[PDB]
């Protein structure tokens, strides 16, 4: 989950591009809260076949539920309200199209790398 | 402490209502990142005079840019992302009618005090 760490140290003139990579399907809250879990899997691979996307999506929902219990401890009402919304949004839209949500995540991670490659080679 | 914290430390039964209260009217992100400032404002008055509402509004935005300023150097991209969502939300929906948000936020706080009382009276 170091990729999210790098992105947090992005140069001030790249953040707006970073803020735009996320969306209601893949909120930035999700990208951070489960960054470890997210970076553990090959998303391009999970998006290649329906079988892989179906399982990944099933577990994403599990990780979101596991985090819901986490912020429930912290009394992080805010983040309980967010994950609650996020989970409901993901279910109604991707429970019959797990490949679609997989593509989105895959695309975002590719974009984060592509963005980092710009800032990285921007040291000349 | 703030009235927001007192609400966070509420029974799981009271939270459901706390969440239903911020489903539409205004983002709980705002209610939380600016709880101190939000609570230190006469919204009932700001709701009756348009010019005052515009000025309280201008101030709310100012407070946002202040935090956004800090979070920018602390490299807390997720917090910046929340603030950014608040501005776009306020900019499009209340810049041309600040008195509206003035009423909404006024109401919400009125509804929060109710939760604090029902919860307090439940201490018997
Ligand atoms: Ni000004």
JSON list of C-alpha atoms and ligand atoms in Angstrom, two decimals:
[
{"chain": "A", "resi": 1, "resn": "UNK", "atom": "CA", "xyz": [0.00, 0.00, 0.00]},
{"chain": "A", "resi": 2, "resn": "UNK", "atom": "CA", "xyz": [2.99, 2.26, -0.53]},
{"chain": "A", "resi": 3, "resn": "UNK", "atom": "CA", "xyz": [1.58, 3.60, -3.82]},
{"chain": "A", "resi": 4, "resn": "UNK", "atom": "CA", "xyz": [-0.99, 5.61, -1.88]},
{"chain": "A", "resi": 5, "resn": "UNK", "atom": "CA", "xyz": [1.87, 6.86, 0.32]},
{"chain": "A", "resi": 6, "resn": "UNK", "atom": "CA", "xyz": [3.75, 8.13, -2.71]},
{"chain": "A", "resi": 7, "resn": "UNK", "atom": "CA", "xyz": [0.62, 9.80, -4.05]},
{"chain": "A", "resi": 8, "resn": "UNK", "atom": "CA", "xyz": [0.19, 11.67, -0.78]},
{"chain": "A", "resi": 9, "resn": "UNK", "atom": "CA", "xyz": [3.62, 13.20, -1.28]},
{"chain": "A", "resi": 10, "resn": "UNK", "atom": "CA", "xyz": [2.74, 14.33, -4.79]},
{"chain": "A", "resi": 11, "resn": "UNK", "atom": "CA", "xyz": [3.93, 17.73, -5.82]},
{"chain": "A", "resi": 12, "resn": "UNK", "atom": "CA", "xyz": [1.31, 20.42, -5.19]},
{"chain": "A", "resi": 13, "resn": "UNK", "atom": "CA", "xyz": [0.88, 20.88, -8.95]},
{"chain": "A", "resi": 14, "resn": "UNK", "atom": "CA", "xyz": [-0.41, 17.32, -9.49]},
{"chain": "A", "resi": 15, "resn": "UNK", "atom": "CA", "xyz": [-3.08, 17.01, -6.79]},
{"chain": "A", "resi": 16, "resn": "UNK", "atom": "CA", "xyz": [-5.92, 18.40, -8.86]},
{"chain": "A", "resi": 17, "resn": "UNK", "atom": "CA", "xyz": [-5.16, 15.65, -11.40]},
{"chain": "A", "resi": 18, "resn": "UNK", "atom": "CA", "xyz": [-5.10, 13.16, -8.51]},
{"chain": "A", "resi": 19, "resn": "UNK", "atom": "CA", "xyz": [-8.42, 14.36, -7.07]},
{"chain": "A", "resi": 20, "resn": "UNK", "atom": "CA", "xyz": [-9.98, 13.76, -10.49]},
{"chain": "A", "resi": 21, "resn": "UNK", "atom": "CA", "xyz": [-8.93, 10.12, -10.77]},
{"chain": "A", "resi": 22, "resn": "UNK", "atom": "CA", "xyz": [-11.52, 9.23, -8.12]},
{"chain": "A", "resi": 23, "resn": "UNK", "atom": "CA", "xyz": [-15.26, 9.08, -8.30]},
{"chain": "A", "resi": 24, "resn": "UNK", "atom": "CA", "xyz": [-18.47, 7.87, -6.70]},
{"chain": "A", "resi": 25, "resn": "UNK", "atom": "CA", "xyz": [-17.70, 4.35, -7.95]},
{"chain": "A", "resi": 26, "resn": "UNK", "atom": "CA", "xyz": [-14.20, 4.50, -6.50]},
{"chain": "A", "resi": 27, "resn": "UNK", "atom": "CA", "xyz": [-14.19, 7.21, -3.74]},
{"chain": "A", "resi": 28, "resn": "UNK", "atom": "CA", "xyz": [-10.89, 8.48, -2.39]},
{"chain": "A", "resi": 29, "resn": "UNK", "atom": "CA", "xyz": [-11.97, 7.30, 1.06]},
{"chain": "A", "resi": 30, "resn": "UNK", "atom": "CA", "xyz": [-11.99, 3.75, -0.26]},
{"chain": "A", "resi": 31, "resn": "UNK", "atom": "CA", "xyz": [-8.62, 4.26, -1.96]},
{"chain": "A", "resi": 32, "resn": "UNK", "atom": "CA", "xyz": [-7.10, 5.16, 1.41]},
{"chain": "A", "resi": 33, "resn": "UNK", "atom": "CA", "xyz": [-8.96, 3.06, 3.98]},
{"chain": "A", "resi": 34, "resn": "UNK", "atom": "CA", "xyz": [-8.33, -0.19, 2.08]},
{"chain": "A", "resi": 35, "resn": "UNK", "atom": "CA", "xyz": [-5.20, 0.86, 0.25]},
{"chain": "A", "resi": 36, "resn": "UNK", "atom": "CA", "xyz": [-3.34, -2.28, 1.52]},
{"chain": "A", "resi": 37, "resn": "UNK", "atom": "CA", "xyz": [-6.09, -4.64, 0.33]},
{"chain": "A", "resi": 38, "resn": "UNK", "atom": "CA", "xyz": [-6.46, -2.71, -2.92]},
{"chain": "A", "resi": 39, "resn": "UNK", "atom": "CA", "xyz": [-2.80, -2.88, -3.82]},
{"chain": "A", "resi": 40, "resn": "UNK", "atom": "CA", "xyz": [-2.54, -6.62, -2.98]},
{"chain": "A", "resi": 41, "resn": "UNK", "atom": "CA", "xyz": [-4.50, -7.75, -6.08]},
{"chain": "A", "resi": 42, "resn": "UNK", "atom": "CA", "xyz": [-3.91, -7.52, -9.83]},
{"chain": "A", "resi": 43, "resn": "UNK", "atom": "CA", "xyz": [-6.91, -5.46, -10.92]},
{"chain": "A", "resi": 44, "resn": "UNK", "atom": "CA", "xyz": [-6.26, -5.73, -14.64]},
{"chain": "A", "resi": 45, "resn": "UNK", "atom": "CA", "xyz": [-6.39, -9.48, -14.03]},
{"chain": "A", "resi": 46, "resn": "UNK", "atom": "CA", "xyz": [-9.55, -9.28, -11.91]},
{"chain": "A", "resi": 47, "resn": "UNK", "atom": "CA", "xyz": [-11.18, -7.36, -14.73]},
{"chain": "A", "resi": 48, "resn": "UNK", "atom": "CA", "xyz": [-10.19, -9.84, -17.40]},
{"chain": "A", "resi": 49, "resn": "UNK", "atom": "CA", "xyz": [-12.83, -12.48, -16.59]},
{"chain": "A", "resi": 50, "resn": "UNK", "atom": "CA", "xyz": [-16.22, -12.22, -14.93]},
{"chain": "A", "resi": 51, "resn": "UNK", "atom": "CA", "xyz": [-15.22, -14.97, -12.47]},
{"chain": "A", "resi": 52, "resn": "UNK", "atom": "CA", "xyz": [-12.28, -13.01, -11.08]},
{"chain": "A", "resi": 53, "resn": "UNK", "atom": "CA", "xyz": [-14.26, -9.74, -10.88]},
{"chain": "A", "resi": 54, "resn": "UNK", "atom": "CA", "xyz": [-17.14, -11.42, -9.13]},
{"chain": "A", "resi": 55, "resn": "UNK", "atom": "CA", "xyz": [-14.89, -12.74, -6.39]},
{"chain": "A", "resi": 56, "resn": "UNK", "atom": "CA", "xyz": [-12.89, -9.52, -6.02]},
{"chain": "A", "resi": 57, "resn": "UNK", "atom": "CA", "xyz": [-16.08, -7.45, -5.80]},
{"chain": "A", "resi": 58, "resn": "UNK", "atom": "CA", "xyz": [-17.46, -9.85, -3.19]},
{"chain": "A", "resi": 59, "resn": "UNK", "atom": "CA", "xyz": [-14.39, -9.31, -1.04]},
{"chain": "A", "resi": 60, "resn": "UNK", "atom": "CA", "xyz": [-14.32, -5.55, -1.60]},
{"chain": "A", "resi": 61, "resn": "UNK", "atom": "CA", "xyz": [-17.75, -5.49, -0.02]},
{"chain": "A", "resi": 62, "resn": "UNK", "atom": "CA", "xyz": [-16.36, -7.63, 2.80]},
{"chain": "A", "resi": 63, "resn": "UNK", "atom": "CA", "xyz": [-13.44, -5.27, 3.39]},
{"chain": "A", "resi": 64, "resn": "UNK", "atom": "CA", "xyz": [-15.87, -2.34, 3.43]},
{"chain": "A", "resi": 65, "resn": "UNK", "atom": "CA", "xyz": [-17.96, -4.14, 6.05]},
{"chain": "A", "resi": 66, "resn": "UNK", "atom": "CA", "xyz": [-14.85, -4.96, 8.07]},
{"chain": "A", "resi": 67, "resn": "UNK", "atom": "CA", "xyz": [-13.92, -1.26, 8.01]},
{"chain": "A", "resi": 68, "resn": "UNK", "atom": "CA", "xyz": [-17.45, -0.29, 8.95]},
{"chain": "A", "resi": 69, "resn": "UNK", "atom": "CA", "xyz": [-16.88, -2.17, 12.18]},
{"chain": "A", "resi": 70, "resn": "UNK", "atom": "CA", "xyz": [-13.55, -0.36, 12.56]},
{"chain": "A", "resi": 71, "resn": "UNK", "atom": "CA", "xyz": [-14.92, 3.18, 12.31]},
{"chain": "A", "resi": 72, "resn": "UNK", "atom": "CA", "xyz": [-17.76, 2.06, 14.56]},
{"chain": "A", "resi": 73, "resn": "UNK", "atom": "CA", "xyz": [-15.20, 1.57, 17.30]},
{"chain": "A", "resi": 74, "resn": "UNK", "atom": "CA", "xyz": [-13.54, 4.88, 16.68]},
{"chain": "A", "resi": 75, "resn": "UNK", "atom": "CA", "xyz": [-16.90, 6.45, 16.81]},
{"chain": "A", "resi": 76, "resn": "UNK", "atom": "CA", "xyz": [-15.96, 7.90, 13.43]},
{"chain": "A", "resi": 77, "resn": "UNK", "atom": "CA", "xyz": [-19.59, 8.70, 12.63]},
{"chain": "A", "resi": 78, "resn": "UNK", "atom": "CA", "xyz": [-18.36, 10.52, 9.53]},
{"chain": "A", "resi": 79, "resn": "UNK", "atom": "CA", "xyz": [-16.59, 7.53, 8.02]},
{"chain": "A", "resi": 80, "resn": "UNK", "atom": "CA", "xyz": [-19.40, 5.23, 9.09]},
{"chain": "A", "resi": 81, "resn": "UNK", "atom": "CA", "xyz": [-21.75, 7.45, 7.10]},
{"chain": "A", "resi": 82, "resn": "UNK", "atom": "CA", "xyz": [-19.37, 7.41, 4.12]},
{"chain": "A", "resi": 83, "resn": "UNK", "atom": "CA", "xyz": [-18.77, 3.65, 3.92]},
{"chain": "A", "resi": 84, "resn": "UNK", "atom": "CA", "xyz": [-22.49, 3.18, 4.47]},
{"chain": "A", "resi": 85, "resn": "UNK", "atom": "CA", "xyz": [-23.18, 5.32, 1.37]},
{"chain": "A", "resi": 86, "resn": "UNK", "atom": "CA", "xyz": [-20.30, 3.82, -0.63]},
{"chain": "A", "resi": 87, "resn": "UNK", "atom": "CA", "xyz": [-21.41, 0.26, 0.02]},
{"chain": "A", "resi": 88, "resn": "UNK", "atom": "CA", "xyz": [-24.99, 1.05, -0.99]},
{"chain": "A", "resi": 89, "resn": "UNK", "atom": "CA", "xyz": [-23.82, 2.77, -4.15]},
{"chain": "A", "resi": 90, "resn": "UNK", "atom": "CA", "xyz": [-21.50, -0.12, -5.12]},
{"chain": "A", "resi": 91, "resn": "UNK", "atom": "CA", "xyz": [-24.19, -2.73, -4.60]},
{"chain": "A", "resi": 92, "resn": "UNK", "atom": "CA", "xyz": [-26.93, -1.12, -6.65]},
{"chain": "A", "resi": 93, "resn": "UNK", "atom": "CA", "xyz": [-24.54, -0.52, -9.55]},
{"chain": "A", "resi": 94, "resn": "UNK", "atom": "CA", "xyz": [-21.97, -3.27, -9.72]},
{"chain": "A", "resi": 95, "resn": "UNK", "atom": "CA", "xyz": [-23.51, -6.39, -8.21]},
{"chain": "A", "resi": 96, "resn": "UNK", "atom": "CA", "xyz": [-24.56, -7.49, -11.72]},
{"chain": "A", "resi": 97, "resn": "UNK", "atom": "CA", "xyz": [-21.57, -5.94, -13.42]},
{"chain": "A", "resi": 98, "resn": "UNK", "atom": "CA", "xyz": [-18.50, -6.74, -11.30]},
{"chain": "A", "resi": 99, "resn": "UNK", "atom": "CA", "xyz": [-16.20, -6.38, -14.30]},
{"chain": "A", "resi": 100, "resn": "UNK", "atom": "CA", "xyz": [-17.21, -2.77, -14.68]},
{"chain": "A", "resi": 101, "resn": "UNK", "atom": "CA", "xyz": [-16.19, -1.81, -11.17]},
{"chain": "A", "resi": 102, "resn": "UNK", "atom": "CA", "xyz": [-13.02, -3.83, -11.63]},
{"chain": "A", "resi": 103, "resn": "UNK", "atom": "CA", "xyz": [-12.15, -1.88, -14.78]},
{"chain": "A", "resi": 104, "resn": "UNK", "atom": "CA", "xyz": [-12.62, 1.46, -13.01]},
{"chain": "A", "resi": 105, "resn": "UNK", "atom": "CA", "xyz": [-10.26, 0.52, -10.16]},
{"chain": "A", "resi": 106, "resn": "UNK", "atom": "CA", "xyz": [-7.79, -0.95, -12.65]},
{"chain": "A", "resi": 107, "resn": "UNK", "atom": "CA", "xyz": [-7.91, 2.29, -14.63]},
{"chain": "A", "resi": 108, "resn": "UNK", "atom": "CA", "xyz": [-7.45, 4.45, -11.56]},
{"chain": "A", "resi": 109, "resn": "UNK", "atom": "CA", "xyz": [-4.39, 2.54, -10.36]},
{"chain": "A", "resi": 110, "resn": "UNK", "atom": "CA", "xyz": [-2.90, 2.80, -13.83]},
{"chain": "A", "resi": 111, "resn": "UNK", "atom": "CA", "xyz": [-3.57, 6.53, -13.82]},
{"chain": "A", "resi": 112, "resn": "UNK", "atom": "CA", "xyz": [-1.97, 6.98, -10.40]},
{"chain": "A", "resi": 113, "resn": "UNK", "atom": "CA", "xyz": [1.16, 5.32, -11.72]},
{"chain": "A", "resi": 114, "resn": "UNK", "atom": "CA", "xyz": [1.09, 7.31, -14.94]},
{"chain": "A", "resi": 115, "resn": "UNK", "atom": "CA", "xyz": [0.76, 10.50, -12.85]},
{"chain": "A", "resi": 116, "resn": "UNK", "atom": "CA", "xyz": [3.61, 9.47, -10.57]},
{"chain": "A", "resi": 117, "resn": "UNK", "atom": "CA", "xyz": [5.79, 8.77, -13.60]},
{"chain": "A", "resi": 118, "resn": "UNK", "atom": "CA", "xyz": [5.25, 12.38, -14.64]},
{"chain": "A", "resi": 119, "resn": "UNK", "atom": "CA", "xyz": [6.22, 13.85, -11.28]},
{"chain": "A", "resi": 120, "resn": "UNK", "atom": "CA", "xyz": [9.06, 11.34, -10.95]},
{"chain": "A", "resi": 121, "resn": "UNK", "atom": "CA", "xyz": [10.66, 12.24, -14.28]},
{"chain": "A", "resi": 122, "resn": "UNK", "atom": "CA", "xyz": [9.91, 15.87, -13.41]},
{"chain": "A", "resi": 123, "resn": "UNK", "atom": "CA", "xyz": [13.16, 16.22, -11.45]},
{"chain": "A", "resi": 124, "resn": "UNK", "atom": "CA", "xyz": [15.40, 17.59, -14.20]},
{"chain": "B", "resi": 1, "resn": "UNK", "atom": "CA", "xyz": [-15.20, 20.03, 22.99]},
{"chain": "B", "resi": 2, "resn": "UNK", "atom": "CA", "xyz": [-18.05, 20.59, 20.53]},
{"chain": "B", "resi": 3, "resn": "UNK", "atom": "CA", "xyz": [-21.70, 19.65, 20.14]},
{"chain": "B", "resi": 4, "resn": "UNK", "atom": "CA", "xyz": [-20.58, 17.40, 17.27]},
{"chain": "B", "resi": 5, "resn": "UNK", "atom": "CA", "xyz": [-18.49, 15.24, 19.61]},
{"chain": "B", "resi": 6, "resn": "UNK", "atom": "CA", "xyz": [-21.30, 14.88, 22.12]},
{"chain": "B", "resi": 7, "resn": "UNK", "atom": "CA", "xyz": [-23.36, 13.50, 19.25]},
{"chain": "B", "resi": 8, "resn": "UNK", "atom": "CA", "xyz": [-20.64, 11.09, 18.13]},
{"chain": "B", "resi": 9, "resn": "UNK", "atom": "CA", "xyz": [-20.59, 9.40, 21.52]},
{"chain": "B", "resi": 10, "resn": "UNK", "atom": "CA", "xyz": [-24.20, 8.31, 21.09]},
{"chain": "B", "resi": 11, "resn": "UNK", "atom": "CA", "xyz": [-25.83, 4.86, 21.24]},
{"chain": "B", "resi": 12, "resn": "UNK", "atom": "CA", "xyz": [-25.99, 2.93, 17.98]},
{"chain": "B", "resi": 13, "resn": "UNK", "atom": "CA", "xyz": [-29.74, 3.54, 18.19]},
{"chain": "B", "resi": 14, "resn": "UNK", "atom": "CA", "xyz": [-29.32, 7.31, 18.16]},
{"chain": "B", "resi": 15, "resn": "UNK", "atom": "CA", "xyz": [-26.75, 7.25, 15.34]},
{"chain": "B", "resi": 16, "resn": "UNK", "atom": "CA", "xyz": [-29.31, 5.98, 12.81]},
{"chain": "B", "resi": 17, "resn": "UNK", "atom": "CA", "xyz": [-31.17, 9.25, 13.32]},
{"chain": "B", "resi": 18, "resn": "UNK", "atom": "CA", "xyz": [-27.91, 11.22, 13.21]},
{"chain": "B", "resi": 19, "resn": "UNK", "atom": "CA", "xyz": [-27.24, 9.72, 9.77]},
{"chain": "B", "resi": 20, "resn": "UNK", "atom": "CA", "xyz": [-30.73, 10.21, 8.41]},
{"chain": "B", "resi": 21, "resn": "UNK", "atom": "CA", "xyz": [-30.27, 13.86, 9.34]},
{"chain": "B", "resi": 22, "resn": "UNK", "atom": "CA", "xyz": [-27.34, 14.30, 6.95]},
{"chain": "B", "resi": 23, "resn": "UNK", "atom": "CA", "xyz": [-28.51, 12.15, 4.06]},
{"chain": "B", "resi": 24, "resn": "UNK", "atom": "CA", "xyz": [-29.35, 15.08, 1.85]},
{"chain": "B", "resi": 25, "resn": "UNK", "atom": "CA", "xyz": [-29.23, 18.56, 3.27]},
{"chain": "B", "resi": 26, "resn": "UNK", "atom": "CA", "xyz": [-25.56, 19.16, 3.67]},
{"chain": "B", "resi": 27, "resn": "UNK", "atom": "CA", "xyz": [-22.52, 16.92, 3.72]},
{"chain": "B", "resi": 28, "resn": "UNK", "atom": "CA", "xyz": [-21.53, 15.52, 7.11]},
{"chain": "B", "resi": 29, "resn": "UNK", "atom": "CA", "xyz": [-17.99, 16.29, 6.03]},
{"chain": "B", "resi": 30, "resn": "UNK", "atom": "CA", "xyz": [-18.77, 19.99, 6.42]},
{"chain": "B", "resi": 31, "resn": "UNK", "atom": "CA", "xyz": [-20.64, 19.44, 9.68]},
{"chain": "B", "resi": 32, "resn": "UNK", "atom": "CA", "xyz": [-17.54, 17.72, 11.04]},
{"chain": "B", "resi": 33, "resn": "UNK", "atom": "CA", "xyz": [-14.51, 19.52, 9.62]},
{"chain": "B", "resi": 34, "resn": "UNK", "atom": "CA", "xyz": [-16.06, 22.85, 10.60]},
{"chain": "B", "resi": 35, "resn": "UNK", "atom": "CA", "xyz": [-18.03, 21.80, 13.67]},
{"chain": "B", "resi": 36, "resn": "UNK", "atom": "CA", "xyz": [-16.42, 24.39, 15.98]},
{"chain": "B", "resi": 37, "resn": "UNK", "atom": "CA", "xyz": [-16.99, 27.28, 13.55]},
{"chain": "B", "resi": 38, "resn": "UNK", "atom": "CA", "xyz": [-20.40, 25.96, 12.50]},
{"chain": "B", "resi": 39, "resn": "UNK", "atom": "CA", "xyz": [-21.54, 25.97, 16.12]},
{"chain": "B", "resi": 40, "resn": "UNK", "atom": "CA", "xyz": [-20.15, 29.48, 16.70]},
{"chain": "B", "resi": 41, "resn": "UNK", "atom": "CA", "xyz": [-22.65, 31.11, 14.30]},
{"chain": "B", "resi": 42, "resn": "UNK", "atom": "CA", "xyz": [-26.16, 32.53, 14.51]},
{"chain": "B", "resi": 43, "resn": "UNK", "atom": "CA", "xyz": [-27.75, 30.68, 11.57]},
{"chain": "B", "resi": 44, "resn": "UNK", "atom": "CA", "xyz": [-31.27, 31.66, 12.58]},
{"chain": "B", "resi": 45, "resn": "UNK", "atom": "CA", "xyz": [-30.36, 35.29, 12.05]},
{"chain": "B", "resi": 46, "resn": "UNK", "atom": "CA", "xyz": [-28.26, 34.54, 8.97]},
{"chain": "B", "resi": 47, "resn": "UNK", "atom": "CA", "xyz": [-31.37, 32.86, 7.59]},
{"chain": "B", "resi": 48, "resn": "UNK", "atom": "CA", "xyz": [-33.57, 35.96, 7.72]},
{"chain": "B", "resi": 49, "resn": "UNK", "atom": "CA", "xyz": [-31.29, 38.53, 6.04]},
{"chain": "B", "resi": 50, "resn": "UNK", "atom": "CA", "xyz": [-29.86, 37.68, 2.61]},
{"chain": "B", "resi": 51, "resn": "UNK", "atom": "CA", "xyz": [-26.89, 40.02, 2.93]},
{"chain": "B", "resi": 52, "resn": "UNK", "atom": "CA", "xyz": [-25.97, 38.52, 6.31]},
{"chain": "B", "resi": 53, "resn": "UNK", "atom": "CA", "xyz": [-26.40, 35.02, 4.90]},
{"chain": "B", "resi": 54, "resn": "UNK", "atom": "CA", "xyz": [-24.02, 35.99, 2.07]},
{"chain": "B", "resi": 55, "resn": "UNK", "atom": "CA", "xyz": [-21.47, 37.23, 4.59]},
{"chain": "B", "resi": 56, "resn": "UNK", "atom": "CA", "xyz": [-21.72, 34.21, 6.93]},
{"chain": "B", "resi": 57, "resn": "UNK", "atom": "CA", "xyz": [-21.37, 32.13, 3.74]},
{"chain": "B", "resi": 58, "resn": "UNK", "atom": "CA", "xyz": [-18.27, 34.08, 2.66]},
{"chain": "B", "resi": 59, "resn": "UNK", "atom": "CA", "xyz": [-16.85, 33.36, 6.10]},
{"chain": "B", "resi": 60, "resn": "UNK", "atom": "CA", "xyz": [-17.60, 29.61, 5.94]},
{"chain": "B", "resi": 61, "resn": "UNK", "atom": "CA", "xyz": [-15.65, 29.49, 2.70]},
{"chain": "B", "resi": 62, "resn": "UNK", "atom": "CA", "xyz": [-12.84, 31.40, 4.33]},
{"chain": "B", "resi": 63, "resn": "UNK", "atom": "CA", "xyz": [-12.62, 28.92, 7.18]},
{"chain": "B", "resi": 64, "resn": "UNK", "atom": "CA", "xyz": [-12.48, 26.13, 4.63]},
{"chain": "B", "resi": 65, "resn": "UNK", "atom": "CA", "xyz": [-9.52, 27.70, 2.75]},
{"chain": "B", "resi": 66, "resn": "UNK", "atom": "CA", "xyz": [-7.80, 28.09, 6.13]},
{"chain": "B", "resi": 67, "resn": "UNK", "atom": "CA", "xyz": [-7.95, 24.37, 6.96]},
{"chain": "B", "resi": 68, "resn": "UNK", "atom": "CA", "xyz": [-7.30, 23.48, 3.29]},
{"chain": "B", "resi": 69, "resn": "UNK", "atom": "CA", "xyz": [-4.13, 25.56, 3.70]},
{"chain": "B", "resi": 70, "resn": "UNK", "atom": "CA", "xyz": [-2.87, 23.45, 6.62]},
{"chain": "B", "resi": 71, "resn": "UNK", "atom": "CA", "xyz": [-3.90, 20.09, 5.18]},
{"chain": "B", "resi": 72, "resn": "UNK", "atom": "CA", "xyz": [-1.96, 21.07, 2.08]},
{"chain": "B", "resi": 73, "resn": "UNK", "atom": "CA", "xyz": [1.37, 21.26, 3.90]},
{"chain": "B", "resi": 74, "resn": "UNK", "atom": "CA", "xyz": [0.57, 18.34, 6.19]},
{"chain": "B", "resi": 75, "resn": "UNK", "atom": "CA", "xyz": [0.12, 16.39, 2.91]},
{"chain": "B", "resi": 76, "resn": "UNK", "atom": "CA", "xyz": [-3.31, 15.12, 4.03]},
{"chain": "B", "resi": 77, "resn": "UNK", "atom": "CA", "xyz": [-4.74, 14.66, 0.52]},
{"chain": "B", "resi": 78, "resn": "UNK", "atom": "CA", "xyz": [-7.87, 12.92, 1.74]},
{"chain": "B", "resi": 79, "resn": "UNK", "atom": "CA", "xyz": [-8.77, 15.91, 3.95]},
{"chain": "B", "resi": 80, "resn": "UNK", "atom": "CA", "xyz": [-8.14, 18.25, 1.01]},
{"chain": "B", "resi": 81, "resn": "UNK", "atom": "CA", "xyz": [-10.41, 15.97, -1.00]},
{"chain": "B", "resi": 82, "resn": "UNK", "atom": "CA", "xyz": [-13.20, 16.38, 1.57]},
{"chain": "B", "resi": 83, "resn": "UNK", "atom": "CA", "xyz": [-12.90, 20.15, 1.77]},
{"chain": "B", "resi": 84, "resn": "UNK", "atom": "CA", "xyz": [-12.85, 20.27, -2.06]},
{"chain": "B", "resi": 85, "resn": "UNK", "atom": "CA", "xyz": [-16.11, 18.34, -2.14]},
{"chain": "B", "resi": 86, "resn": "UNK", "atom": "CA", "xyz": [-17.65, 20.81, 0.30]},
{"chain": "B", "resi": 87, "resn": "UNK", "atom": "CA", "xyz": [-16.71, 23.85, -1.77]},
{"chain": "B", "resi": 88, "resn": "UNK", "atom": "CA", "xyz": [-18.06, 22.44, -5.01]},
{"chain": "B", "resi": 89, "resn": "UNK", "atom": "CA", "xyz": [-21.19, 21.46, -3.10]},
{"chain": "B", "resi": 90, "resn": "UNK", "atom": "CA", "xyz": [-21.61, 24.96, -1.61]},
{"chain": "B", "resi": 91, "resn": "UNK", "atom": "CA", "xyz": [-20.47, 26.80, -4.72]},
{"chain": "B", "resi": 92, "resn": "UNK", "atom": "CA", "xyz": [-23.11, 25.29, -6.99]},
{"chain": "B", "resi": 93, "resn": "UNK", "atom": "CA", "xyz": [-26.01, 25.01, -4.60]},
{"chain": "B", "resi": 94, "resn": "UNK", "atom": "CA", "xyz": [-25.78, 28.04, -2.31]},
{"chain": "B", "resi": 95, "resn": "UNK", "atom": "CA", "xyz": [-23.73, 30.79, -3.93]},
{"chain": "B", "resi": 96, "resn": "UNK", "atom": "CA", "xyz": [-26.83, 32.19, -5.54]},
{"chain": "B", "resi": 97, "resn": "UNK", "atom": "CA", "xyz": [-28.99, 31.59, -2.50]},
{"chain": "B", "resi": 98, "resn": "UNK", "atom": "CA", "xyz": [-27.09, 31.55, 0.78]},
{"chain": "B", "resi": 99, "resn": "UNK", "atom": "CA", "xyz": [-30.20, 32.06, 2.84]},
{"chain": "B", "resi": 100, "resn": "UNK", "atom": "CA", "xyz": [-31.28, 28.53, 1.85]},
{"chain": "B", "resi": 101, "resn": "UNK", "atom": "CA", "xyz": [-28.25, 26.82, 3.35]},
{"chain": "B", "resi": 102, "resn": "UNK", "atom": "CA", "xyz": [-28.67, 29.22, 6.24]},
{"chain": "B", "resi": 103, "resn": "UNK", "atom": "CA", "xyz": [-32.07, 27.65, 6.97]},
{"chain": "B", "resi": 104, "resn": "UNK", "atom": "CA", "xyz": [-30.95, 24.07, 6.32]},
{"chain": "B", "resi": 105, "resn": "UNK", "atom": "CA", "xyz": [-28.01, 24.25, 8.73]},
{"chain": "B", "resi": 106, "resn": "UNK", "atom": "CA", "xyz": [-30.18, 26.14, 11.22]},
{"chain": "B", "resi": 107, "resn": "UNK", "atom": "CA", "xyz": [-32.74, 23.29, 11.16]},
{"chain": "B", "resi": 108, "resn": "UNK", "atom": "CA", "xyz": [-30.13, 20.53, 11.42]},
{"chain": "B", "resi": 109, "resn": "UNK", "atom": "CA", "xyz": [-28.67, 22.04, 14.61]},
{"chain": "B", "resi": 110, "resn": "UNK", "atom": "CA", "xyz": [-32.18, 22.37, 16.04]},
{"chain": "B", "resi": 111, "resn": "UNK", "atom": "CA", "xyz": [-32.66, 18.68, 15.30]},
{"chain": "B", "resi": 112, "resn": "UNK", "atom": "CA", "xyz": [-29.31, 17.82, 16.90]},
{"chain": "B", "resi": 113, "resn": "UNK", "atom": "CA", "xyz": [-30.16, 19.50, 20.20]},
{"chain": "B", "resi": 114, "resn": "UNK", "atom": "CA", "xyz": [-33.24, 17.31, 20.23]},
{"chain": "B", "resi": 115, "resn": "UNK", "atom": "CA", "xyz": [-31.03, 14.20, 20.06]},
{"chain": "B", "resi": 116, "resn": "UNK", "atom": "CA", "xyz": [-28.89, 15.50, 22.89]},
{"chain": "B", "resi": 117, "resn": "UNK", "atom": "CA", "xyz": [-31.98, 16.01, 25.06]},
{"chain": "B", "resi": 118, "resn": "UNK", "atom": "CA", "xyz": [-33.74, 12.74, 24.29]},
{"chain": "B", "resi": 119, "resn": "UNK", "atom": "CA", "xyz": [-30.41, 11.01, 24.98]},
{"chain": "B", "resi": 120, "resn": "UNK", "atom": "CA", "xyz": [-29.88, 12.99, 28.18]},
{"chain": "B", "resi": 121, "resn": "UNK", "atom": "CA", "xyz": [-33.40, 12.22, 29.44]},
{"chain": "B", "resi": 122, "resn": "UNK", "atom": "CA", "xyz": [-32.71, 8.56, 28.65]},
{"chain": "B", "resi": 123, "resn": "UNK", "atom": "CA", "xyz": [-30.18, 8.70, 31.51]},
{"chain": "B", "resi": 124, "resn": "UNK", "atom": "CA", "xyz": [-32.86, 7.47, 33.93]},
{"chain": "C", "resi": 1, "resn": "LIG", "atom": "NI1", "xyz": [-12.98, 37.67, 1.67]}
]
